[PDB]
């Protein structure tokens, strides 16, 4: 269960440019060759997105605010899921999203979460498809009210948008091939709606679930021999913005205008043109 790590190094965090990332489909309505103006929780264009890149690195609990844009460019699959909640203990409800090779598990329960929640990842006889997961996320899970099992959604940039509005937890996602190591790619890629969860819970904080390998063992000490948890991900925060989204012939959002970015975007959203 809970492994208490000590002398945790803080994750270094730089500030990258958002460019035009994080646009999602705001509804499930097919629109063809139009410009649709919508007011919603969007990541603003060219915003400061904080980049957490990387012994023992701290896995920080970050604020949720009005919704989280979460991107990752990883090949080791160190990020396995996220926890969401307010106290992140048994006094309040909490949301847990865990992926594996076959399924995603989404549970709203009363979790007494560990201070450093993770998954122990083990390969049986060095077989890369025989991967077993040990839950070191919570010490207890009581009065559990929601559970949902589906297909997993975890070179390739993976982007997610998490919103908690009207009693619904909405997740949007996109996976695109990129050729950058430093920062987020330019261009446009709209995030398709992944899941709407009727859970009706209060979310103010969130934390990334890591995957650690037991590299070596020390008898008597359960905090030794795990990997450092060197994970790199981008976190941005959604704000209430008006966006002018261009839907092409086949119904795909190809470009957007953030109406409050500069006077030219204000003019574009007033004229309803690009």
């Amino acid at each position, epitope marked *: 269960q809970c492994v208490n790590f000590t002398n945790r190094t803080q994750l270094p965090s730089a500030y990258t440019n958002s460019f035009t990332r994080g646009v999602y489909y705001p509804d499930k309505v097919f629109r063809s060759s139009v410009l649709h103006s919508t007011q919603d929780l969007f990541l603003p264009f060219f915003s400061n997105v904080t980049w957490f890149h990387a012994k023992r690195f701290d896995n920080p609990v970050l604020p949720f605010n009005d919704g989280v844009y979460f991107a990752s460019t990883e090949k080791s699959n160190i990020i396995r899921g996220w926890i969401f909640g307010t106290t992140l203990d048994s006094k309040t409800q909490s949301l847990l999203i865990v992926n594996n090779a076959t399924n995603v598990v989404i549970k709203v329960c009363e979790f007494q979460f560990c201070n450093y929640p993770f998954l*122990g990842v083990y390969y049986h006889k060095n077989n890369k498809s025989w991967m*077993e997961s040990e*839950f070191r996320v919570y*010490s207890s899970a009581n009065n559990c009210t929601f559970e949902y099992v589906s297909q997993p959604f975890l070179k390739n940039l993976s982007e997610f948008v998490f919103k908690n509005i009207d009693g619904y937890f909405k997740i949007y996602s996109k996976h695109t091939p990129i050729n950058l190591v430093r920062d987020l790619p330019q261009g446009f890629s709209a995030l398709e709606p992944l899941v709407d969860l009727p859970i009706g819970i209060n979310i103010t904080r969130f934390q990334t679930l890591l995957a650690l390998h037991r590299s070596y*063992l020390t008898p008597g000490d*359960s905090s030794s021999g795990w990997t450092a948890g060197a994970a790199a991900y981008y976190v941005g925060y959604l704000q209430p913005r008006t966006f002018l989204l261009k839907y092409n012939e086949n119904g795909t959002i190809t470009d957007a205008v953030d109406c409050a970015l500069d006077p030219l975007s204000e003019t574009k959203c007033t004229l309803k043109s690009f």
Partner: antibody
Amino acid sequence: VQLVQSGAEVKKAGSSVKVSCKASGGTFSSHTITWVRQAPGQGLEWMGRIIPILGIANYAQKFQGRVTITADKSTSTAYMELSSLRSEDTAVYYCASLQTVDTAIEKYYGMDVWGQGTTVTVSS
Amino acid sequence: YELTQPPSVSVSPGQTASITCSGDKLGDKYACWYQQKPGQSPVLVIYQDNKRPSGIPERFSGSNSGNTATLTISGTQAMDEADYYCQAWDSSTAVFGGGTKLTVLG
């Protein structure tokens, strides 16, 4: 993690023996307490296991219906009760611990911490 | 499930000691190796067929191929005279070998 057991002792044949294993303070949060016995002149032999943080006890087929492995989170003590003692039960009873609570992960670990062993002998 | 193990292996001090452990398809299973001095608790010296716990000296090594798991000691010195137990996990039950009494000649 340190496992401390009860004292070496003698019991009646057909009596009830109650062997304790006092762990450290934070041990039962994330450990599995196995019980392994060693007869004098023979090798080790697995008797059972307990996961106290989620409260299950699994037993060997030879000891099933005879032993009952319990735990106490407040005193942090894993108990092993063995009833109907015969002459073949005189053994050193070790409590061992694994750094896992999921029993499918137990193949990736060994019994790294062991108790000092309780010598249980019987006499009419 | 049963694990077969030789009863005794005797080596010279400073030579390489090999202790085998046969089993039915043991190469598909993880085998731990435990060391027990006379009058002491067992000490885990090999887990996951080849990995040492920290604090175990580097001369202990392990392998597991086919039907046999082998514990090898390179440069056997005076503190290796013990009993060595091969342990496997079958159907989420630990099973132990008979144990080899490794002695050091004098």
